Design a protein around this ligand. Structure first.
Ligand SMILES: Nc1ncnc2c1ncn2[C@@H]1O[C@H](COP(=O)(O)OP(=O)(O)O)[C@@H](O)[C@H]1O
Ligand SMILES: Nc1ncnc2c1ncn2[C@@H]1O[C@H](COP(=O)(O)OP(=O)(O)O)[C@@H](O)[C@H]1O
Ligand SMILES: Nc1cncn1[C@@H]1O[C@H](COP(=O)(O)O)[C@@H](O)[C@H]1O
Ligand SMILES: Nc1cncn1[C@@H]1O[C@H](COP(=O)(O)O)[C@@H](O)[C@H]1O
Ligand SMILES: [Mg+2]
Ligand SMILES: [Mg+2]
Lengths: 383, 377
């Protein structure tokens, strides 16, 4: 309510990946102490934490131990089960609560909640068996997209249905998992907005980012998004309605499709700092992580003004040697590396924020470094 | 020379105070590891370091152990025995070198480096005994200031001589330590410029800050400095010349006196990030701390554009209670606290950067919080 977590207190983080690490580094500038729970020793967050607890996420004893030594608890890992979430809510201080998190773990549930909040989404149907798939294909026609409702840390369970010739692969997906069938949205841009809401109801919204995915992994975020002033205003208003309606405490990332015609469809929500918000570390007055900490500790929120245009580029395992090799060429670039021990080809290892007065020059900078030639080549065929 | 210390390597820091802490936080965002040597456990910097070495600064064994685990070494306070820095220069990797520190560690030898580069200083005389003090006073007249050549602590530091009646206070200081007597500079404003130069010779300068001291402790830094454009250009030019002539690697803070006739006297040099540079964490494209790491590791330097006007306000021991009690009123304020355990009245505990499109609105916010009532005379 009016409850404040003062500097000097301990912030407990569930999950020790890069999101937890950047939260921690933000909290440390303000003099907070950090405890982290992660299943692997020497996690990115653990490298900046005062206290490390190595345990499984579903281990209630370990969760209780984190809670016991923390003045406030937050998470970067979303898939926390109901028994741990309830324990934390009632026996520790978890200002984000569990309601929003319970709405966002299932695609169908999420879409229902978005519509209940008064916002538009692609027309969708629940698919729990072959018969519901057949009906959904009838009602939505082609083209359409069948996705799993839960899990998939990459986007593994997705089948795009362009013709009757696609039905058989969709049936295979519907066999392995509860699914959702969505109308295919013709759109020009994928954009996202990070919205922040504090314990006391104060809200701030970041600018709209334009997001470029390659292999279903975020490649670039571009701010300002290359859209009309009217599309931006709409994306921002939608994000605000969601934060109000969902009674957000903490950070909410809202991912959207923007059509040439100026309509927005909400694609998905993440109740946490998000990859499409990393630009904020170097280009805005407050980062999504500093905002996250203020929101849960109930400090006044910072400003979210864009101070300079930016292009964020992800560094995957496949890019790390190229980055190190090209280090002398990183003028106008702000490098972030997460300290991950084991590199893997599509593992997120870091990101680089390219700040420039002109967005097209920053984009040209990423191309001229030649680190992401693979991504740039995959970006054709285009449309 | 073209040598590069890559992200992933370990940076060793001598000293575990707030400057080292903020270096470390900057370094970790790029994926560096951090070793720190400090005599007291759980120092501000150790709370963020991967490796902590608790030992004295003169403990050569521990210094050896610092070098061993580090791919590059830097320091975060000046009162290191320049002899320890000479061991690291020859047997480890200390791109900043020992010579720049030795020159700026002594107010007298510092004057000489400034004069060599051709810039104005207050006319000065070395004072080693009462006879020399008498001759210096006769030569330089009133008003004048007596300063110890070395040391940045203790209950002495300096004596301002307005008239003959201040002399007895000066005689006491003159007996305690080696001093210089300097002509009093009539200045409109104190300003500072932080200049950065990498191992490869790339040079960046930050915007000129106007600094306001109370009890000879920095209270506020104001950026942009409320000075004319020509004065700003001169400050910047003077800092570049200094970095050039001193063969600077790393960070250099240059403190200056801006006079009514538009002249600049160099007051003091610091071969490290400086309190008057903390504004850069929130108002510049790159902080003095990110620039420092980039300089010594030989990465390209970041840009130093002022992205928004700012007033940095110091948080001393006397203020910490007020800050924590007033946290709910810090809209538009960016708070930095260093993790120091013991508040002492005039100990630097943290700082707050107040960002606002209007410098006077930032300044007014500082007053309206009422935390610094002591300072606002
Ligand atoms: N209804 C739809 N219409 C058009 N394109 C879609 C639709 N659903 C998904 N996509 C495309 O597929 C990509 C992945 O879908 P998404 O729902 O974001 O799953 P994930 O969270 O696994 O990435 C999106 O970035 C978008 O390009
Ligand atoms: N020659 C001088 N003329 C006028 N004021 C001075 C002079 N020297 C120092 N001061 C004032 O006293 C303050 C402290 O002096 P300084 O030499 O910076 O000592 P310290 O390095 O211990 O702070 C300065 O910030 C300035 O305001
Ligand atoms: N991307 C994402 C979605 N939800 C969490 N993450 C971040 O990705 C890390 C997982 O990365 P890895 O699989 O490389 O350990 C998590 O800990 C968290 O920071
Ligand atoms: N202010 C200053 C001038 N030179 C170094 N410092 C910083 O102040 C710390 C010492 O402060 P304290 O004496 O409060 O511990 C040092 O380690 C360094 O970071
Ligand atoms: Mg997606
Ligand atoms: Mg000084």
């Amino acid at each position: 309510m009016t409850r404040i977590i003062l500097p000097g207190k301990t912030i407990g983080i569930i999950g020790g990946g890069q999101l937890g690490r950047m939260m921690a580094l933000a909290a440390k500038e303000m003099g907070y102490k950090i405890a982290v729970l992660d299943p692997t020793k020497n996690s990115p967050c653990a490298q900046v934490a005062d206290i490390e607890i190595v345990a499984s996420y579903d281990d209630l004893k370990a969760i209780q131990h984190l809670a016991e030594i923390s003045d406030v608890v937050t998470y970067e890992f979303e898939n926390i089960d109901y028994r741990c979430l309830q324990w934390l809510e009632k026996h520790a201080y978890l200002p984000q609560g569990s309601q929003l998190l319970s709405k966002t773990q299932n695609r169908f549930t999420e879409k229902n909640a978005i519509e209940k909040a008064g916002l538009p989404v692609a027309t969708y149907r629940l698919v729990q068996n072959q018969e519901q798939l057949t009906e959904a294909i009838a009602e939505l026609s082609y083209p359409s997209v069948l996705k799993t409702t839960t899990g998939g840390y990459d986007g593994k369970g997705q089948v795009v249905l362009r013709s009757e010739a696609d039905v058989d692969e969709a049936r295979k997906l519907a066999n392995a998992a509860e699914c959702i069938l969505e109308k295919w949205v013709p759109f020009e841009k994928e954009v996202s907005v990070i919205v922040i809401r504090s314990v006391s109801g104060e809200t701030k919204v970041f600018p709209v980012a334009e997001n470029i995915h390659v292999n279903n992994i975020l490649h670039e975020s571009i701010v300002p998004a290359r859209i009309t002033e009217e599309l931006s205003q709409k994306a921002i208003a939608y994000a605000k309605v969601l934060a109000d309606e969902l009674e957000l405490v903490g950070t909410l990332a809202v991912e959207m499709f923007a059509t040439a015609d100026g309509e927005i469809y909400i694609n998905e929500l993440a109740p946490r700092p998000h990859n499409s918000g990393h630009y904020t570390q170097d280009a805005c007055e407050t980062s999504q992580f500093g905002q996250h900490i203020r929101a849960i500790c109930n400090l006044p929120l910072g400003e979210t003004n864009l101070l300079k245009p930016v292009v964020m580029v992800n560094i995957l395992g496949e890019h790390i040697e190229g980055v190190l090799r090209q280090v002398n060429r990183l003028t106008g670039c702000y490098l972030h590396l997460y300290g991950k021990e084991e590199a893997k080809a599509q593992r997120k290892m870091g990101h680089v924020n390219i700040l420039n007065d002109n967005i097209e020059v920053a984009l040209e900078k990423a191309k001229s470094l030649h680190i992401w030639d693979h991504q740039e080549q995959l970006l054709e065929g285009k449309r």
